[PDB]
Design a protein around this ligand. Sequence first.
Ligand SMILES: O=C1N2C=C(c3ccc(O)cc3)N=C(Cc3ccccc3)C2=N[C@@]1(Cc1ccc(O)cc1)OO
Length: 187
Amino acid sequence: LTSDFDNPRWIGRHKHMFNFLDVNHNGKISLDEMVYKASDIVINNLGATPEQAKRHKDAVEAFFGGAGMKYGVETDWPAYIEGWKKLATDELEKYAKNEPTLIRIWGDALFDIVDKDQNGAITLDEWKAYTKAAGIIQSSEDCEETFRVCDIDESGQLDVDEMTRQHLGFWYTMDPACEKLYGGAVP
Ligand SMILES: O=C1N2C=C(c3ccc(O)cc3)N=C(Cc3ccccc3)C2=N[C@@]1(Cc1ccc(O)cc1)OO
């Protein structure tokens, strides 16, 4: 429901992600890298069309732009987490006005690519395909946890509306009910 920026676990969740994103361990990451990673995944691993990839890129671009990242600029850890506070509150503000959040826009873009039927719902195998391609999750075990937490069994599908809700609490408010959204892959 609300921000929780001084919760060491909120900082830890994003510190983990920051380190996951800083593959070359430069201690900084740029928007160029983020958008490269986003498009490399959908085009080279998930077979998205140029149009789909484009929509997905614009979404990823806005997402990390909301955290203050920019092209031709390297964001270090301190700026990153500070910038994340702003992203989180802006997202919360959009939420309040029933305005599409940046994370919502991303999900829609991504699910249209990952969902074979292009309906906004993906299977456990599709979730695994995406998560393991991006690297955010490494084991099938942690991917199942996602469904266990979203309340969808191995045969049902994860819907974007439901996942969005999960992300609001996982990434923005530290909602206790969203713990283990990514199994043990993300603190
Ligand atoms: O949510 C997601 N992510 C959050 C962060 C992330 C990054 C930094 C942070 O501080 C916090 C979170 N990083 C990645 C992985 C990624 C990063 C950059 C480019 C491509 C992919 C990621 N993939 C998503 C995509 C997604 C979006 C909406 C949905 O409904 C379903 C799936 O799946 O859960």
